[PDB]
């Protein structure tokens, strides 16, 4: 990793992150065969099997009722990202819901627990059967529940049953609580064996396969599931796994803290508002303004392209002489000088103005330095901690090349506009001169 | 559903949603009888029963420690909605916590599992007894734990006991992990049978009853639970179910995307800020800026009236006269053109400006059209997908009627204000002319 401290705007750009960006969805249609359960009844009295059976049958009868229904950029992007994801999944479920499709899916899963199927709407879904509970209900429990009078002395039957149905009950709990669309793929929707199998079936390049098989916790976290319905005594649901159709492109993250300066003892501040993740996608700079969008593992940042806002390729001039770029770099500005620490990956920005006492220290030495007032950049090699009055921040002990891009801060070099002096999220040349 | 593209402000209004607005709370007070458990001790050694017994007795002892503690309109509204709900619930629990009223509740539940009770503070709470654990502990377990021996060969009772107490232990986790106020009504606080009873007991019109019995997942979502405490060996807690005292009134949702124009080659944009849900309530337009509260099922939009801000009835002029109206329609305006898709219910708004290449296509045909730059409105009938450079958005294949309300966009027809050009959340006439 690299981290250029941009002195003139009290902001770091951290660079050399690589990219993984979701660009499509891959569908696995699970058929969890709940079994023959509604042909079995316990009618003698209270019993262990009856209680598990009643839960299983009641959960199935419940699940039949559950169904799905089928500028400050951050609030925009995370609005679009969720709406796009659900609409893309729903549009596929609305094909699978057709009885002419369910019966095809079910038929190819007659002979095998895994099938690849093309829906009539063209999507080449994978299909999977989950079948352990059907096998138990058919081979064991039907034979044991006998002429009702299921209060048999065999308790291995009852304890066994409470194990096999447990997945099914968890799938019901999750879809019912979420009204048919789970936010993430639990181990109950898709076990690790099924996720690894589904990844290995995706129509993708081997690099994505290896990367996804390593990061399968991320694949599970980006995907989500939709309940198709209950057909016969199979619950059918689909899991949308991500497809990471852009990988390995450059990304960087911009962090900033208030660059204040005092004129006749009045402070003037600006803050860069263009903070957050940026990546190059297919020869376009793309900005991911919402903090849910992107997540890091190592150098790889896992963003979602539906959240990205395209920004002009000139916008990187906000990272090199923003003081003279013609691009409208978004800043806030105003009087009140917040003093704060912004933790970057390879260090900390420390905004420290009139008032608070800022210092940096090491666990081995104590106070190394009293920081000058004004924005300072503290590499994670200069110190182990930064303090802002009594508050202490531990720094990230991470290796990488810090850099300083020197320059007299903008707020120290332009006069603020007399009125309005406080302006929120404005092009910089409205704050100064 | 109906949807008008308001051409002059790049915003849709979608109409024909029907209100279902929560206006009060119905209390169900549950006496979950944990039973005689504190008179049972296993003292021979490790045993199955002892482990379940110790979990029960420990959880009960833990539960006794638990008790409850007692313009950017979105941040305002959702705060008020949260605070009002808890205060309305707590004000009733402070009645029931009086021993003079627990003892009445408990007494009316002596020979019936369901009782309707009036508190001394006048609220007609429903009251419910849960007894399944007490019945087991009294008739089965107390009889088996002879003389503190309980390494007993009747493994049915150990396995059976771990079924009966599971509700109790789940209730204890949910209250303890939330310090006495759950965010929602789990199946462990209130089972499906008890919710169906509670809905059927509400003092409400049959239209509400039928509607609530159908949408009971939503009733479960809007309600919440408060722990009233442990009295003897009953935990007492209450579930505040919603009362939907406004239904069937008109609602609509406004969506917008940046309407920009290159007046003198540089852009000027505005964005409508008055986005989100509106409903007519009792002859007043009410605006629901919280994205958390309003939630559609079919045509019904479920909202909380405590989250609503009343807006003048003239405010609908922003959907006809925004260029000409004298109501202060809130917009943001400024230089930088975001290009983005806003997915409406029946289509997509597609903001596509200098830079990105936007196209619409169908799975059957590929690219149908290259979109003109400027805001465009794409019905879900024109295409299955919209793209913004490499990004693809699937459209909602939902039948409905789409309209265009024509007019030259405001930002193309009025000259921007020269300073400050970028203004956030301002009345429209501060941006233009």
């Amino acid at each position, epitope marked *: 990793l690299k981290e250029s401290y941009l002195e003139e705007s009290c902001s770091t750009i951290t660079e050399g992150y690589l990219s993984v960006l*979701r660009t499509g969805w891959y569908t696995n249609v699970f058929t969890l065969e709940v079994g023959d359960v509604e042909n079995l009844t316990c009618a003698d009295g209270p019993s262990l099997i009856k209680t598990e059976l009643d839960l299983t049958k009641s959960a199935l009868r419940e699940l039949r009722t559950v169904s799905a229904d089928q500028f400050v950029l951050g609030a925009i992007a995370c609005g679009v990202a969720t709406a796009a994801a659900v609409t893309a999944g729903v549009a596929i479920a609305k094909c699978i819901r057709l009885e002419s499709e369910v019966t095809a899916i079910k038929n190819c899963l007659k002979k095998t627990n895994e099938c690849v199927s093309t829906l009539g709407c063209g999507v080449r879904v994978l299909a999977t059967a989950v079948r352990e509970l059907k096998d138990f209900v058919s081979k064991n429990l039907t034979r044991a529940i006998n002429k009702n009078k299921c209060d048999i002395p065999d308790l291995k039957m009852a304890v066994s049953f409470s194990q096999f149905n447990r997945r099914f009950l968890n799938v019901v709990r999750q879809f019912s609580d979420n009204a048919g669309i789970t936010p993430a793929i639990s181990k109950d929707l898709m076990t690790d064996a099924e996720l690894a199998r589904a990844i290995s079936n995706m129509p993708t390049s081997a690099g*994505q396969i290896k990367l996804m098989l390593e990061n399968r916790a991320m694949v599970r976290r980006k995907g989500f599931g939709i309940l198709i319905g209950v057909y016969g005594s199979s619950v059918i649901y689909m899991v949308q796994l991500p497809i990471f159709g852009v990988i390995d492109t450059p990304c960087w993250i911009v962090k900033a803290a208030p660059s204040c300066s005092e004129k006749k003892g009045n402070y003037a501040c600006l803050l860069r508002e263009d903070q957050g993740w940026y990546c190059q996608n297919a020869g*376009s700079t793309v900005y991911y303004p919402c903090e849910k969008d992107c997540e890091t593992r190592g150098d790889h940042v896992f963003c979602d392209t539906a959240a990205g806002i395209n920004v002009a390729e000139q916008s990187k001039e906000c990272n090199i002489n923003i003081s003279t770029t013609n691009y409208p770099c978004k800043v806030s500005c105003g009087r009140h000088p917040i003093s704060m620490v912004a933790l970057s990956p390879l260090g900390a920005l420390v905004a420290c103005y009139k008032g608070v006492s800022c210092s940096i220290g090491s666990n081995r030495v104590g106070i190394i330095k009293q920081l000058n007032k004004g924005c300072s950049y503290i590499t994670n090699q200069d110190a182990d901690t930064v303090t802002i009055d009594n508050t202490v921040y531990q720094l990230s002990k991470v290796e990488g090349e810090q850099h300083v891009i020197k320059g007299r801060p903008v707020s120290s070099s332009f006069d603020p506009v007399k009125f309005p002096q406080d302006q929120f999220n404005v092009a910089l040349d409205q704050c100064f001169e | 559903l109906k949807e008008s593209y308001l051409e002059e402000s790049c915003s849709t209004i979608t109409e024909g949603y029907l209100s279902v607005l929560r206006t009060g709370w119905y209390t169900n007070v549950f006496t979950l009888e944990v039973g005689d458990v504190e008179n049972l001790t296993c003292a021979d050694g490790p045993s199955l029963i002892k482990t379940e017994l110790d979990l029960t007795k420990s959880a009960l002892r833990e539960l006794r420690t638990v008790s409850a503690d007692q313009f950017v309109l979105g941040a305002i509204a959702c705060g008020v909605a949260t605070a009002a709900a808890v205060t309305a619930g707590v004000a009733i629990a402070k009645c029931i916590r009086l021993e003079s009223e627990v003892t009445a509740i408990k007494n009316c539940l002596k020979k019936t599992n369901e009782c309707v009770s009036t508190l001394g503070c006048g609220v007609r709470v429903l009251a419910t007894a849960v007894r399944e654990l007490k019945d087991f502990v009294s008739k089965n377990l107390t009889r088996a734990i002879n003389k503190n021996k309980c390494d007993i060969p009747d493994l049915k009772m150990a396995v059976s006991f771990s079924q009966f107490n599971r509700r109790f232990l789940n209730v204890v986790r949910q209250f303890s992990d939330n310090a006495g106020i759950t965010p929602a009504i789990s199946k462990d606080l209130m089972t499906d049978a008890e919710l169906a009873r509670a809905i059927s007991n509400m003092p409400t019109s049959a239209g509400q009853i039928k509607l609530m019995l159908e949408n009971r997942a939503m009733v479960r979502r809007k309600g919440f639970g408060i722990l009233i405490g442990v009295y003897g060996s009953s935990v007492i807690y209450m579930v505040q179910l919603p009362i939907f005292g406004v239904i069937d009134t008109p609602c609509w949702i406004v969506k917008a995307a940046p309407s920009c124009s290159e007046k003198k080659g540089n852009y000027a944009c505005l964005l409508r800020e008055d986005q989100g849900w509106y409903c007519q309530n009792a002859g007043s337009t009410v605006y629901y800026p919280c994205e958390k509260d309003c939630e559609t099922r079919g045509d019904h939009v479920f909202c909380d009236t405590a989250a609503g801000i009343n807006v003048a009835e003239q405010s609908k002029e922003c959907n006809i006269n925004i260029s000409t109206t004298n109501y202060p329609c809130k917009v943001s305006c400024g230089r930088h053109p975001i290009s983005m898709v806003a997915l409406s219910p029946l289509g997509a708004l597609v903001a596509c400006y200098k830079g990105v290449s936007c196209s619409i296509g169908s799975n059957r045909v590929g690219i149908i059209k290259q979109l003109n730059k400027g805001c465009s409105y794409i019905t879900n009938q024109d295409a299955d997908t919209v793209t913004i450079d490499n990004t693809v958005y699937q459209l909602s294949k939902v039948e409905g009627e789409q309209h265009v309300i024509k007019g030259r966009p405001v930002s193309s027809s009025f000259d921007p204000v020269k300073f400050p050009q970028d203004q956030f959340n301002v009345a429209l006439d501060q941006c233009f002319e």
Partner: nanobody
Amino acid sequence: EVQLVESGGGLVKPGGSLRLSCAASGFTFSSYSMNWVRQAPGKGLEWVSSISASSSYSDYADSAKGRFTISRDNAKTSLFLQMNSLRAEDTAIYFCARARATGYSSITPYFDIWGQGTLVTVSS
């Protein structure tokens, strides 16, 4: 203009070595995967190798594995193919191509911009 320009193709004796170079210009070269494709005279196109946008992944056809080595310099905006042990059957026009994909359905890349290709002759 968005242009790729191959160079370094020429005559090589079998068993010789060569290094094709494809200068890229007019686009954000560090954003795109890059490929080499070849065409034996009058035959169909054969894909040869590919490199990811930051060189983290490299792929080769079975004919190219071990014999070739693709590399890129994102600062020089230049793409290279080292070639070794050139067989007579490696006589072909070699094109570099910019490679691009939409992840929506599947990740199969396609070659939107091609260079005009450099002729490599492998003969006595």
